[PDB]
Amino acid sequence: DDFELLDGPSDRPFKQRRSFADRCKEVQQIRDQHPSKIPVIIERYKGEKQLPVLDKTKFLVPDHVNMSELVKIIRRRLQLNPTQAFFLLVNQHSMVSVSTPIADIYEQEKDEDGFLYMVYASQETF
């Protein structure tokens, strides 16, 4: 008999863990409190098995932060070694070398609930 692999909460997308209604509520509270900050959900890609699971899911980012800069923050938070491939994606595009302010990306790419969703993986495209 083979092992049966069980799935934890992280194995479930944030959108399935908290209802659409509750997510909307959470965004509108935090945007009222910090109008100059962007609410971001960062999760490991569902197919990614080599990079570790992040400790937290919900982040607040000052809106003048460049995307490429946010990518390095997350890379350090995961404590990756220099040779480990790492892509942080918004709407499946790599933000790794994107110099755009996150305020502008938020305008363009935020979800209906008001969060900006990002996913990380070992490649942008296989």
Swiss-Prot record:
Record keywords, A-Z: Autophagy, Cytoplasm, Cytoplasmic vesicle, Cytoskeleton, Lipoprotein, Membrane, Microtubule, Phosphoprotein, Ubl conjugation pathway
InterPro entries the record matches: Atg8-like (IPR004241), Ubiquitin-like_domsf (IPR029071)
Superkingdom in the source lineage: Eukaryota
Topology versus the membrane: Lipid-anchor
Region (Important for interaction with ATG13 and for autophagosome formation): 56-60
Sites bearing Phosphoserine, chain numbering: 19
PTM description: The precursor molecule is cleaved by ATG4 (ATG4A, ATG4B, ATG4C or ATG4D) to expose the glycine at the C-terminus and form the cytosolic form, LC3-I. The processed form is then activated by APG7L/ATG7, transferred to ATG3 and conjugated to phosphatidylethanolamine (PE) phospholipid to form the membrane-bound form, LC3-II. During non-canonical autophagy, the processed form is conjugated to phosphatidylserine (PS) phospholipid. ATG4 proteins also mediate the delipidation of PE-conjugated forms.
Annotated effect of mutating residue 58 to A: Decreases interaction with ATG13 and strongly reduces autophagosome formation
Predominant location category: membrane
Coiled coil, from the record: none
Effect of residue 60 to A: Decreases interaction with ATG13
Annotated tissue distribution: Most abundant in heart, brain, liver, skeletal muscle and testis but absent in thymus and peripheral blood leukocytes.
GO biological process: autophagosome assembly; autophagosome maturation; autophagy of mitochondrion; cellular response to amino acid starvation; cellular response to copper ion; cellular response to hydrogen peroxide; cellular response to nitrogen starvation; cellular response to oxygen-glucose deprivation
Disulfide bonds, paired cysteine numbers: none
Record's GO cellular component terms: autolysosome; autophagosome; autophagosome membrane; cytosol; glutamatergic synapse; late endosome; microtubule; organelle membrane
GO MF term list: microtubule binding; phosphatidylethanolamine binding; phospholipid binding; ubiquitin protein ligase binding
Compartment(s): Cytoplasmic vesicle, Autophagosome membrane; Endomembrane system; Cytoplasm, Cytoskeleton
Pfam families on file: ATG8
Function: Ubiquitin-like modifier involved in formation of autophagosomal vacuoles (autophagosomes). While LC3s are involved in elongation of the phagophore membrane, the GABARAP/GATE-16 subfamily is essential for a later stage in autophagosome maturation. Through its interaction with the reticulophagy receptor TEX264, participates in the remodeling of subdomains of the endoplasmic reticulum into autophagosomes upon nutrient stress, which then fuse with lysosomes for endoplasmic reticulum turnover.
Subunit field text: 3 different light chains, LC1 (a cleavage product of MAP1B), LC2 (a cleavage product of MAP1A) and LC3 (produced by one of the MAP1LC3 genes), can associate with the MAP1A or MAP1B heavy chains. Interacts with TP53INP1 and TP53INP2. Directly interacts with SQSTM1; this interaction leads to MAP1LC3A recruitment to inclusion bodies containing polyubiquitinated protein aggregates and to inclusion body degradation by autophagy. Interacts with ATG13. Interacts with ULK1. Interacts with TBC1D5. Found in a complex with UBQLN1 and UBQLN2. Interacts with UBQLN4 (via STI1 1 and 2 domains). (Microbial infection) Interacts with NS1-2 of human norovirus GII.4; this interaction does not seem to be linked to autophagy, but rather plays a role in the formation of viral factories.
Protein name: Microtubule-associated protein 1 light chain 3 alpha
